[PDB]
Design a protein around this motif. Structure first.
Motif, mmCIF file in Angstrom:
data_model
loop_
_atom_site.group_PDB
_atom_site.id
_atom_site.type_symbol
_atom_site.label_atom_id
_atom_site.label_comp_id
_atom_site.label_asym_id
_atom_site.label_seq_id
_atom_site.Cartn_x
_atom_site.Cartn_y
_atom_site.Cartn_z
ATOM 1 N N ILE B 295 -8.720 81.475 -10.157
ATOM 2 C CA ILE B 295 -8.912 80.159 -9.567
ATOM 3 C C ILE B 295 -9.296 80.223 -8.099
ATOM 4 O O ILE B 295 -9.874 79.291 -7.574
ATOM 5 N N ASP B 296 -8.979 81.309 -7.443
ATOM 6 C CA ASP B 296 -9.330 81.445 -6.041
ATOM 7 C C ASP B 296 -10.803 81.829 -5.922
ATOM 8 O O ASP B 296 -11.537 81.187 -5.197
ATOM 9 N N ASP B 297 -11.229 82.869 -6.643
ATOM 10 C CA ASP B 297 -12.604 83.295 -6.603
ATOM 11 C C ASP B 297 -13.531 82.157 -6.966
ATOM 12 O O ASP B 297 -14.654 82.098 -6.492
ATOM 13 N N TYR B 299 -13.127 79.211 -6.060
ATOM 14 C CA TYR B 299 -13.281 78.402 -4.838
ATOM 15 C C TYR B 299 -14.061 79.066 -3.685
ATOM 16 O O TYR B 299 -14.927 78.398 -3.106
ATOM 17 N N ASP B 300 -13.793 80.370 -3.347
ATOM 18 C CA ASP B 300 -14.532 81.005 -2.235
ATOM 19 C C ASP B 300 -15.686 81.904 -2.629
ATOM 20 O O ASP B 300 -16.303 82.513 -1.745
ATOM 21 N N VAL B 301 -15.997 81.984 -3.906
ATOM 22 C CA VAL B 301 -17.078 82.810 -4.312
ATOM 23 C C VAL B 301 -18.091 82.051 -5.146
ATOM 24 O O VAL B 301 -19.061 81.520 -4.650
ATOM 25 N N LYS B 370 -5.430 72.625 -1.314
ATOM 26 C CA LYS B 370 -5.542 73.460 -0.187
ATOM 27 C C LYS B 370 -6.772 74.324 -0.265
ATOM 28 O O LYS B 370 -7.455 74.486 0.701
ATOM 29 N N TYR B 371 -7.026 74.880 -1.423
ATOM 30 C CA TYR B 371 -8.195 75.709 -1.617
ATOM 31 C C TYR B 371 -9.450 74.868 -1.334
ATOM 32 O O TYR B 371 -10.462 75.363 -0.819
ATOM 33 N N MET B 372 -9.386 73.577 -1.673
ATOM 34 C CA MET B 372 -10.523 72.724 -1.485
ATOM 35 C C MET B 372 -10.880 72.520 -0.031
ATOM 36 O O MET B 372 -12.023 72.770 0.352
ATOM 37 N N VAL B 373 -9.928 72.077 0.773
ATOM 38 C CA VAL B 373 -10.212 71.830 2.182
ATOM 39 C C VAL B 373 -10.891 73.029 2.841
ATOM 40 O O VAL B 373 -11.662 72.872 3.794
ATOM 41 N N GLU B 374 -10.613 74.234 2.313
ATOM 42 C CA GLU B 374 -11.198 75.440 2.831
ATOM 43 C C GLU B 374 -12.641 75.443 2.381
ATOM 44 O O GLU B 374 -13.529 75.750 3.165
ATOM 45 N N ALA B 375 -12.867 75.089 1.102
ATOM 46 C CA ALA B 375 -14.224 75.020 0.558
ATOM 47 C C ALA B 375 -15.011 73.973 1.348
ATOM 48 O O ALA B 375 -16.151 74.191 1.729
ATOM 49 N N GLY B 452 -19.207 85.324 2.880
ATOM 50 C CA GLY B 452 -18.976 83.936 2.513
ATOM 51 C C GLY B 452 -17.529 83.558 2.342
ATOM 52 O O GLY B 452 -16.922 83.813 1.303
ATOM 53 N N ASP B 453 -16.974 82.946 3.378
ATOM 54 C CA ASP B 453 -15.590 82.490 3.381
ATOM 55 C C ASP B 453 -15.297 81.840 4.737
ATOM 56 O O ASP B 453 -15.974 82.123 5.738
ATOM 57 N N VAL B 454 -14.306 80.953 4.763
ATOM 58 C CA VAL B 454 -13.921 80.262 5.982
ATOM 59 C C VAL B 454 -13.449 81.251 7.039
ATOM 60 O O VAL B 454 -13.017 82.365 6.767
HETATM 61 MN MN LIG Z 1 -9.781 81.309 -0.762
#
Ligand SMILES: [Mn+2]
Ligand SMILES: C=C(F)[C@](C)(CCC=C(C)C)OP(=O)(O)OP(=O)(O)O
Ligand SMILES: C=C(F)[C@](C)(CCC=C(C)C)OP(=O)(O)OP(=O)(O)O
Ligand SMILES: [Mn+2]
Ligand SMILES: [Mn+2]
Ligand SMILES: [Mn+2]
Ligand SMILES: [Mn+2]
Ligand SMILES: [Mn+2]
Lengths: 543, 543
Positions: B295-297, B299-301, B370-375, B452-454
């Motif tokens: 679920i993390d990948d 979001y940031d990948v 939380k993962y979203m706001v980062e996206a 690619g990441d915050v």
């Molecule tokens: Mn992430």
């Protein structure tokens, strides 16, 4: 305060179950058998006499090997059929033979071949009655009786052919005609015709009889015994996984008013899903069936009207977000259900690409809904009437539930239309659940209603036309014959939207019930003969 | 036009992960230890030199036997603490010795005993400052450096102590060769003080170091190695359960943009839930940590802003109906998640008697939010402020998810109140995640963002004050030091609603992160030595 309908502990326990480990799970056999086949095969299709063939096909079949010689069975039957020009109503009256004709008819029909009843015409005298002579031909006679079961309503010729060959066969049993080893096979079929006999739980014995047979062949017999053992292993594998699930639920201790019998539940599927390639369905069913069993006892044994009405609603609206409103025992069950359908919709989604949760979810809602009305009648001290009951009956038995679950697993590519049709509860479903039901109600009306439950067929009829249970018993028996005709017609239907395997589980479900309830319940309390049938096909190896 | 953060494959296959079996699983092993125990337990409870006791107490622990000596540790430290008057406000007359004091402090504090910082007062000279003379007691000068980590902000004395003892330890290692062993077992503590060292994945080397210890005992050393192996078997068992689950989800083939590292995901937990009793938690967590990765990948990948804004909203409203509107890969991800929490709340509801689905669902919702706001920032090409980010980071790392999940499987019984406190995300949870977070951002900063990441902690400081990476590195570290201190007060707090085991995992999750994220990216993706510590903790056996 409660009302538990006194049940008993699963005869088999984990240690045994969880231990199980047949040394047939090795490729040594798989391949030896996988080569021994090609023989039995080429033996098969290298043979010349069409009847010699028909003869092997039926045996290979009654022996569980049906799985490997698929396409053979076809071409063989395919040609024969139309190299005998069986596709003609106008009989050519070649004044054929009772035996080979009864057989080629039987198999051809069983494999979906149009074979006019007119065929058996060249075997009747002038009055139109079956020839007097036939009388003398025990063999072919037993072959006709057996084929008189691939009929439909409006098939009088088959109907009476049965009956002819019946007074005959039976009296000949009391006498002999021939053998003594025929005086059983004959009586064997005379108890349950082949068409109503489920293959898997019956092969063994058949493999015996064949091993014995003088004309018997060894490749085959060897193939027969090996494979029988190679699949037992499979069942043992499946059995465990299904066991693992059952243990997890913990109903066994957290829901003890409910019948403990997961082996029995898994076993049913060794009879319904014959095509070995469907292991998952079999496993799943082990579960579906256990679940059902528990839900059913919650409705006609444990639970209260209040409790049911609410249980029934929550399921209806599948409100897991209120799972906290029901009695703790109903929360565990419903969550379990939710967990099962959800896990099941996942594999199916994972492998077939569809979100079937909305459907499976429905299968359960309706079941419960039916379970409810029975509970309402019961508590409401209501007494339906054969028809009233029967219309609910075929659905409160779960056939549709059991069968809609199977469809998705057995079918590799559905539609939506199919699904939808299937879900109005397609006639097939209807008739297959009706056998299940009636048969069940035959061997389970007793303690059923005498331990708290709404009346069932036998009773409903008995009261309806104010008759004896013997008449009730007769009627119900008759009904079963009627529904089979409707079913035969449907299993072969061309417009049927269902694939061979599925419609195959629909028919076999009917045939399995005819075994299970052929003496007792094989569930509620169980029944030796059933118990043995189980130990012998699930736990004991062949020679 | 996806992104795929180009990952690497789990260095451990199926067969391996699926086969392995340390016979230690054999009960005939436990018992041996069950004796060695009572033995080592006596040597313990029969010792008289308090310093000797504490000393062994430290070993038994650092070696991983802490599990069957708890009640001993309690009685002992209990007494020592009383017959020494540690509870009294002062007592510094100049009678104390660095060593035995720097040590009784540690274990006493660590085990929650409140012992003033003023104890080390009796060790300072004129202008205050720690006495120079003891620039000699290298031995006990390590025990000081060691206890200086059991501080809070308000404790300057311990602050200076660490300041002091280092100066020297720092050099004693650039000596000639005292013990040589010392040289390392010193520089050892100088890499990661004991307080920040997860024991479990560390016993090995310690059991070695202790073997040599002339001043050693064999019953202890024997029980020591036995247990390690008796424990490593366990993991191997739990390991598979998670693996089976992991395999079954089929993300590997369906969600291939996602990192493959269930072993690694299981491993983390060998060091978070250290009490062998919590097998299920360790098992469950094997899965949780997996769901997250995936679920993390997503979001940031992989995933897009449309796909993420929608994934997030569904999760939020959590409805398996609108599920049909999600992209395909998200459909699968959600259902598994749903199945995950649903299956977990069952076990809980089952064994503990409560519905936790509503809380667990949450755990994920917040994470995803939380993962979203980062996206959002990321795509929104927005560069946050060290704090802004930091306020998200500790949640968006999953610390709180990991833990709220744990809490239920570790806590015997709780209450809405606790749960609720816990879910506001109790300080304990906030501190523990931060460590996890900052620790991760150190060994995953200039390598994740550069693909690619915050911007992470580092990079954010970097800009904020437009400093260099060392300044950021230096900061973040300082920051990690501060958090620990709050943590230190929270774990020992006598107001914590939390129960011992949970408070442990929280602390250990922090320490485990300081291990994995020490060399490079521990966790997975590409672990340096991280791998050895894994094969060694989970696969190779000890002497
Ligand atoms: Mn992430
Ligand atoms: C479980 C049984 F063997 C049945 C037949 C229920 C139907 C489910 C099966 C066969 C897996 O038990 P029972 O006859 O008591 O259910 P009923 O209350 O519908 O009569
Ligand atoms: C290992 C991490 F801490 C994560 C979050 C993956 C999940 C791991 C658990 C729960 C042990 O990896 P990563 O640091 O790459 O996630 P991030 O992209 O938020 O930094
Ligand atoms: Mn019922
Ligand atoms: Mn019943
Ligand atoms: Mn019944
Ligand atoms: Mn990431
Ligand atoms: Mn990172």
């Amino acid at each position: 305060m409660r009302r538990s309908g006194n049940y008993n502990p699963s005869r088999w326990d984990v240690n045994f179950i969880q231990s199980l480990l047949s040394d047939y799970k090795e490729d040594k056999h798989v391949i030896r058998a996988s080569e021994l086949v090609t023989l039995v095969k080429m033996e098969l299709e290298k043979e010349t006499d069409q009847i010699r063939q028909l003869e092997l096909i039926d045996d290979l079949q009654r022996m569980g090997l049906s799985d490997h010689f698929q396409n053979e069975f076809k071409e063989i039957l395919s040609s024969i059929y139309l190299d005998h020009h069986y596709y003609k109503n106008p009989f050519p009256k070649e004044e054929r033979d009772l035996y080979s004709t009864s057989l080629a008819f039987r198999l051809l029909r069983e494999h979906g071949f149009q074979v006019a009843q007119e065929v058996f015409d060249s075997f009747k005298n002038e009055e139109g009655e079956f020839k007097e002579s036939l009388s003398d031909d025990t063999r072919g006679l037993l072959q006709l009786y057996e084929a008189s079961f691939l009929l439909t309503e409006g098939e009088t010729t088959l109907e009476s052919a049965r009956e002819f060959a019946t007074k005959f066969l039976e009296e000949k049993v009391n006498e002999g005609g021939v053998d003594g080893d025929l005086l059983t096979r004959i009586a064997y079929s005379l108890d349950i015709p082949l068409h109503w006999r489920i293959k898997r739980p019956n092969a063994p014995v058949w493999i015996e009889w064949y091993r014995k047979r003088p004309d018997m062949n060894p490749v085959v017999l060897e193939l027969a015994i090996l494979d029988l053992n190679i699949v037992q292993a499979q069942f043992q594998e499946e059995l465990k996984e299904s066991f693992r699930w059952w243990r997890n639920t913990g109903f066994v201790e957290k829901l003890p008013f409910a019948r403990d019998r997961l082996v029995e539940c898994y076993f049913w599927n060794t009879g319904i899903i014959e095509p070995r390639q469907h292991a998952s369905a079999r496993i799943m069913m082990g579960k579906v069936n256990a679940l059902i069993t528990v839900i059913d006892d919650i409705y006609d044994v444990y639970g209260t009207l209040e409790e049911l009405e609410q249980f029934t609603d929550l399921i209806r609206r599948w409100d897991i977000n209120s799972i906290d409103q029901l009695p703790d025992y109903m929360q565990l069950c419903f969550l379990a259900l939710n967990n099962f359908v959800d896990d099941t919709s996942y594999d199916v989604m994972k492998e077939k690409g569809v979100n079937v949760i909305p459907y499976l979810r429905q299968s359960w809602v309706d079941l419960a809904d039916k379970y409810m009305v029975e509970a309402r009648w019961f508590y409401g001290g209501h007494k339906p009437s054969l028809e009233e009951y029967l219309e609910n009956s075929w659905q409160s038995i779960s056939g549709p539930c059991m069968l809609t679950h199977i469809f998705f697993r057995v079918t590799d590519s559905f539609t939506k239309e199919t699904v939808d049709s299937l879900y109005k509860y397609h006639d097939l479903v209807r008739w297959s659940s009706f056998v299940l039901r009636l048969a069940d109600d035959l061997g389970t009306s007793v303690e059923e209603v005498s331990r708290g439950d709404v009346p069932k067929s036998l009773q409903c009829y008995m009261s309806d036309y104010n008759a004896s249970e013997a008449e009730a018993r007769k009627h119900v028996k008759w009904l079963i014959a009627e529904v089979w005709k409707k079913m035969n017609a449907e299993r072969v239907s061309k417009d049927s939207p269902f694939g061979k395997d599925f419609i195959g589980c629909a028919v076999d479900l009917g045939r399995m019930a005819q075994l299970m309830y052929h003496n007792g319940d094989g569930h509620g309390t169980q029944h030796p003969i059933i118990h043995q049938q189980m130990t012998r096909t699930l736990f004991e190896p062949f020679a």
